[PDB]
Amino acid sequence: YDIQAWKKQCEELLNLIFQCEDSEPFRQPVDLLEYPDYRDIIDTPMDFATVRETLEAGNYESPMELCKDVRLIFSNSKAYTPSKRSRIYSMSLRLSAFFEEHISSVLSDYKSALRFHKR
Ligand SMILES: CCn1cc(CNC(=O)c2cccnc2)cn1
């Protein structure tokens, strides 16, 4: 029932994601010189360095907010892919499975702790 435990759990999960080879296309903001029309298709760019910086700045109040930004990285990859068989999109699918597998207990523990706090 530790209401704050999610933060270090998310830092550790981000560390695993950065070591994952599948995170390579998502570690920093998409380069507009590489993908010139990126902002014509994607309204809200997102990447793992921005998520980590937001977390470290104390600008996430809950793991649900972090999870919304991480899921945005994957939805942006899906929306920008010309085919569902592209290299970058295929990496986002595997990384999304890994992330969802690990974030599930973080979310459950946090929501349980908050329900206990407000009992
Ligand atoms: C990390 C950035 N990112 C790349 C993709 C896949 N998109 C392409 O390869 C592509 C190339 C040129 C025009 N349209 C699409 C998805 N997110």
Coordinates of N, CA and C and ligand atoms in Angstrom, one line a residue:
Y1 N 0.8 -1.2 0.0 CA 0.0 0.0 0.0 C 0.8 1.3 0.0
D2 N 2.0 1.2 -0.6 CA 2.9 2.4 -0.7 C 2.4 3.2 -1.9
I3 N 1.8 4.4 -1.7 CA 1.3 5.3 -2.7 C 2.4 5.8 -3.6
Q4 N 3.7 5.9 -3.1 CA 4.8 6.4 -3.9 C 5.6 5.4 -4.6
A5 N 5.4 4.1 -4.4 CA 6.3 3.1 -4.9 C 6.4 3.0 -6.4
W6 N 5.3 3.4 -7.1 CA 5.3 3.4 -8.6 C 6.4 4.1 -9.2
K7 N 6.9 5.2 -8.6 CA 7.9 6.0 -9.3 C 9.2 5.3 -9.5
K8 N 9.8 4.7 -8.5 CA 11.0 3.9 -8.7 C 10.8 2.7 -9.5
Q9 N 9.6 2.1 -9.5 CA 9.2 0.9 -10.3 C 9.2 1.4 -11.8
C10 N 8.7 2.6 -12.1 CA 8.8 3.1 -13.4 C 10.2 3.5 -13.9
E11 N 11.0 4.0 -13.0 CA 12.4 4.3 -13.3 C 13.1 3.0 -13.7
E12 N 12.9 1.9 -13.0 CA 13.5 0.7 -13.3 C 13.0 0.1 -14.6
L13 N 11.7 0.2 -14.9 CA 11.2 -0.2 -16.1 C 11.7 0.6 -17.3
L14 N 11.9 1.9 -17.1 CA 12.5 2.7 -18.2 C 13.9 2.3 -18.4
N15 N 14.7 2.0 -17.4 CA 16.1 1.5 -17.5 C 16.1 0.2 -18.4
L16 N 15.1 -0.7 -18.1 CA 15.1 -1.9 -18.9 C 14.8 -1.6 -20.4
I17 N 13.8 -0.7 -20.6 CA 13.4 -0.3 -21.9 C 14.6 0.4 -22.7
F18 N 15.4 1.2 -22.0 CA 16.5 1.8 -22.7 C 17.6 0.8 -23.1
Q19 N 17.8 -0.3 -22.3 CA 18.8 -1.4 -22.7 C 18.2 -2.3 -23.8
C20 N 16.9 -2.3 -24.0 CA 16.2 -3.1 -25.0 C 16.6 -2.6 -26.3
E21 N 17.1 -3.4 -27.2 CA 17.4 -3.0 -28.6 C 16.2 -2.5 -29.3
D22 N 15.0 -3.0 -29.0 CA 13.8 -2.6 -29.7 C 13.4 -1.1 -29.3
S23 N 14.0 -0.5 -28.3 CA 13.7 0.9 -28.0 C 14.5 1.9 -28.8
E24 N 15.5 1.4 -29.6 CA 16.3 2.4 -30.4 C 15.6 3.5 -31.2
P25 N 14.5 3.2 -31.9 CA 13.8 4.3 -32.7 C 13.1 5.3 -31.8
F26 N 12.9 5.0 -30.5 CA 12.0 5.7 -29.6 C 12.7 6.4 -28.4
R27 N 14.0 6.3 -28.4 CA 14.8 6.8 -27.3 C 14.8 8.3 -27.2
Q28 N 14.7 9.0 -28.3 CA 14.8 10.5 -28.4 C 13.7 11.0 -29.3
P29 N 13.3 12.3 -29.3 CA 12.2 12.7 -30.2 C 12.5 12.4 -31.7
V30 N 11.5 12.1 -32.4 CA 11.6 11.8 -33.9 C 12.3 13.1 -34.6
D31 N 13.3 12.8 -35.4 CA 14.1 13.8 -36.0 C 13.3 14.3 -37.3
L32 N 12.9 15.6 -37.3 CA 12.2 16.1 -38.4 C 13.0 16.2 -39.7
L33 N 14.4 16.2 -39.6 CA 15.2 16.2 -40.8 C 15.1 14.8 -41.5
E34 N 15.0 13.8 -40.7 CA 14.9 12.4 -41.1 C 13.4 12.1 -41.7
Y35 N 12.4 12.7 -41.0 CA 11.0 12.5 -41.4 C 10.3 13.8 -41.5
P36 N 10.5 14.5 -42.6 CA 10.0 15.9 -42.7 C 8.6 16.2 -42.5
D37 N 7.7 15.3 -42.8 CA 6.2 15.5 -42.7 C 5.7 14.9 -41.4
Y38 N 6.6 14.5 -40.4 CA 6.2 13.9 -39.2 C 5.0 14.6 -38.5
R39 N 5.2 16.0 -38.3 CA 4.2 16.8 -37.6 C 2.9 17.0 -38.4
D40 N 2.8 16.6 -39.7 CA 1.6 16.7 -40.4 C 0.7 15.5 -40.0
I41 N 1.3 14.4 -39.5 CA 0.5 13.2 -39.2 C 0.4 13.1 -37.7
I42 N 1.5 13.4 -37.0 CA 1.5 13.2 -35.5 C 1.3 14.5 -34.7
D43 N 0.2 14.6 -34.0 CA -0.1 15.8 -33.3 C 0.7 16.0 -32.0
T44 N 1.0 14.9 -31.3 CA 1.7 15.0 -30.1 C 2.9 14.0 -30.1
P45 N 4.1 14.4 -30.5 CA 5.2 13.6 -30.4 C 5.6 13.1 -29.0
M46 N 6.1 11.9 -28.9 CA 6.5 11.4 -27.5 C 7.6 10.4 -27.7
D47 N 8.5 10.4 -26.7 CA 9.7 9.4 -26.8 C 10.1 9.1 -25.3
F48 N 10.9 8.0 -25.2 CA 11.3 7.6 -23.8 C 12.2 8.6 -23.1
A49 N 13.0 9.4 -23.7 CA 13.8 10.4 -23.0 C 12.8 11.4 -22.4
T50 N 11.8 11.9 -23.2 CA 10.8 12.8 -22.6 C 10.1 12.2 -21.5
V51 N 9.7 10.9 -21.5 CA 9.0 10.3 -20.4 C 9.9 10.2 -19.2
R52 N 11.1 9.8 -19.4 CA 12.1 9.7 -18.3 C 12.3 11.1 -17.6
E53 N 12.4 12.2 -18.5 CA 12.7 13.5 -18.0 C 11.4 14.0 -17.2
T54 N 10.2 13.7 -17.7 CA 9.0 14.1 -17.0 C 8.9 13.5 -15.7
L55 N 9.2 12.2 -15.6 CA 9.2 11.4 -14.3 C 10.2 12.0 -13.4
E56 N 11.5 12.3 -13.8 CA 12.5 12.8 -13.0 C 12.3 14.2 -12.5
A57 N 11.6 15.0 -13.3 CA 11.2 16.4 -12.9 C 10.1 16.4 -11.9
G58 N 9.5 15.2 -11.5 CA 8.4 15.2 -10.6 C 7.1 15.8 -11.3
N59 N 7.0 15.5 -12.6 CA 5.8 16.0 -13.4 C 4.8 15.0 -13.8
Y60 N 4.9 13.8 -13.2 CA 3.9 12.7 -13.3 C 3.3 12.6 -11.9
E61 N 2.0 12.7 -11.7 CA 1.3 12.4 -10.5 C 1.0 11.0 -10.2
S62 N 0.9 10.2 -11.3 CA 0.5 8.8 -11.1 C 1.2 7.9 -12.2
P63 N 1.3 6.6 -12.1 CA 1.8 5.8 -13.2 C 0.8 5.7 -14.4
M64 N -0.5 6.0 -14.2 CA -1.4 6.1 -15.3 C -1.0 7.2 -16.3
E65 N -0.5 8.3 -15.7 CA -0.1 9.4 -16.6 C 1.1 9.0 -17.4
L66 N 2.1 8.3 -16.8 CA 3.3 7.8 -17.5 C 2.9 6.8 -18.5
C67 N 2.0 5.9 -18.2 CA 1.5 4.9 -19.1 C 0.8 5.5 -20.3
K68 N 0.0 6.6 -20.1 CA -0.6 7.3 -21.3 C 0.5 7.8 -22.3
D69 N 1.5 8.4 -21.7 CA 2.6 8.9 -22.6 C 3.4 7.8 -23.3
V70 N 3.7 6.7 -22.5 CA 4.3 5.5 -23.2 C 3.5 5.0 -24.3
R71 N 2.1 4.8 -24.1 CA 1.2 4.3 -25.1 C 1.1 5.2 -26.3
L72 N 1.4 6.5 -26.1 CA 1.4 7.5 -27.1 C 2.6 7.3 -28.1
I73 N 3.7 6.9 -27.5 CA 4.9 6.5 -28.3 C 4.5 5.4 -29.3
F74 N 3.8 4.4 -28.8 CA 3.5 3.3 -29.7 C 2.4 3.6 -30.6
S75 N 1.3 4.4 -30.2 CA 0.3 4.8 -31.2 C 0.8 5.7 -32.3
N76 N 1.8 6.6 -31.9 CA 2.4 7.5 -32.9 C 3.2 6.6 -33.9
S77 N 3.9 5.6 -33.5 CA 4.6 4.7 -34.4 C 3.6 4.0 -35.3
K78 N 2.5 3.5 -34.8 CA 1.5 2.9 -35.6 C 0.9 3.8 -36.6
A79 N 0.6 5.1 -36.2 CA 0.0 6.0 -37.1 C 1.0 6.5 -38.2
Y80 N 2.3 6.5 -37.9 CA 3.3 7.0 -38.9 C 3.8 5.9 -39.8
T81 N 3.4 4.6 -39.6 CA 3.9 3.5 -40.3 C 3.2 3.3 -41.7
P82 N 4.0 3.2 -42.8 CA 3.3 3.0 -44.1 C 2.7 1.6 -44.2
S83 N 3.3 0.6 -43.5 CA 2.8 -0.8 -43.5 C 2.9 -1.4 -42.1
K84 N 2.0 -2.3 -41.8 CA 2.1 -3.0 -40.5 C 3.3 -4.0 -40.3
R85 N 4.1 -4.1 -41.4 CA 5.3 -4.9 -41.5 C 6.6 -4.1 -41.5
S86 N 6.5 -2.8 -41.2 CA 7.8 -2.0 -41.2 C 8.7 -2.3 -40.0
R87 N 10.0 -2.1 -40.1 CA 11.0 -2.4 -39.0 C 10.7 -1.6 -37.7
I88 N 10.4 -0.3 -37.8 CA 10.2 0.5 -36.6 C 8.9 0.1 -35.9
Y89 N 7.8 -0.1 -36.7 CA 6.5 -0.5 -36.2 C 6.6 -1.9 -35.5
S90 N 7.3 -2.8 -36.2 CA 7.5 -4.2 -35.6 C 8.2 -4.1 -34.3
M91 N 9.2 -3.2 -34.1 CA 9.9 -3.0 -32.9 C 8.9 -2.4 -31.8
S92 N 8.1 -1.4 -32.2 CA 7.1 -0.9 -31.3 C 6.1 -1.9 -30.8
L93 N 5.7 -2.9 -31.6 CA 4.8 -3.9 -31.2 C 5.4 -4.8 -30.1
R94 N 6.7 -5.2 -30.3 CA 7.3 -6.1 -29.3 C 7.6 -5.3 -28.0
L95 N 8.0 -4.0 -28.2 CA 8.3 -3.2 -27.0 C 7.0 -2.9 -26.2
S96 N 5.9 -2.7 -26.9 CA 4.6 -2.5 -26.3 C 4.2 -3.7 -25.5
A97 N 4.4 -4.9 -26.0 CA 4.1 -6.1 -25.3 C 4.9 -6.2 -24.0
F98 N 6.2 -5.9 -24.1 CA 7.1 -6.0 -22.9 C 6.7 -4.9 -21.9
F99 N 6.4 -3.7 -22.4 CA 6.0 -2.6 -21.5 C 4.7 -3.0 -20.8
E100 N 3.7 -3.5 -21.5 CA 2.4 -3.8 -20.9 C 2.5 -4.9 -19.9
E101 N 3.3 -5.9 -20.2 CA 3.6 -7.0 -19.3 C 4.2 -6.6 -17.9
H102 N 5.0 -5.5 -18.0 CA 5.7 -5.0 -16.8 C 4.9 -4.0 -16.1
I103 N 4.1 -3.1 -16.8 CA 3.4 -2.0 -16.1 C 2.2 -2.4 -15.4
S104 N 1.6 -3.6 -15.8 CA 0.4 -4.1 -15.2 C 0.4 -4.1 -13.7
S105 N 1.4 -4.7 -13.1 CA 1.5 -4.8 -11.6 C 1.8 -3.4 -11.0
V106 N 2.5 -2.5 -11.7 CA 2.8 -1.2 -11.2 C 1.4 -0.4 -11.0
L107 N 0.6 -0.5 -12.1 CA -0.7 0.1 -12.0 C -1.6 -0.5 -11.0
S108 N -1.6 -1.8 -10.9 CA -2.5 -2.5 -9.9 C -2.1 -2.1 -8.5
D109 N -0.8 -2.1 -8.2 CA -0.3 -1.9 -6.9 C -0.6 -0.4 -6.5
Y110 N -0.4 0.5 -7.5 CA -0.7 1.9 -7.2 C -2.2 2.1 -6.9
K111 N -3.1 1.6 -7.8 CA -4.5 1.8 -7.6 C -5.0 1.1 -6.3
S112 N -4.4 0.0 -5.9 CA -4.8 -0.7 -4.7 C -4.3 0.2 -3.5
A113 N -3.1 0.7 -3.5 CA -2.6 1.6 -2.4 C -3.5 2.8 -2.3
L114 N -3.9 3.4 -3.4 CA -4.8 4.6 -3.3 C -6.2 4.3 -2.8
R115 N -6.7 3.1 -3.2 CA -8.0 2.7 -2.6 C -7.9 2.5 -1.1
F116 N -6.7 1.9 -0.6 CA -6.5 1.7 0.8 C -6.4 3.0 1.5
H117 N -5.7 4.0 0.9 CA -5.5 5.3 1.5 C -6.9 6.0 1.7
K118 N -7.8 5.8 0.7 CA -9.1 6.5 0.8 C -10.2 5.6 1.4
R119 N -9.8 4.4 2.1 CA -10.8 3.5 2.6 C -11.8 4.1 3.6
Ligands
LIG1 C1 10.6 6.7 -35.0 C2 9.9 7.4 -36.2 N1 9.0 6.5 -36.9 C3 9.2 6.0 -38.1 C4 8.1 5.2 -38.4 C5 7.9 4.3 -39.6 N2 7.7 5.2 -40.8 C6 8.5 5.2 -41.9 O1 9.5 4.5 -42.0 C7 8.2 6.3 -42.9 C8 9.2 6.8 -43.7 C9 8.8 7.9 -44.6 C10 7.5 8.3 -44.6 N3 6.5 7.8 -43.8 C11 6.9 6.7 -43.0 C12 7.2 5.3 -37.3 N4 7.8 6.2 -36.4

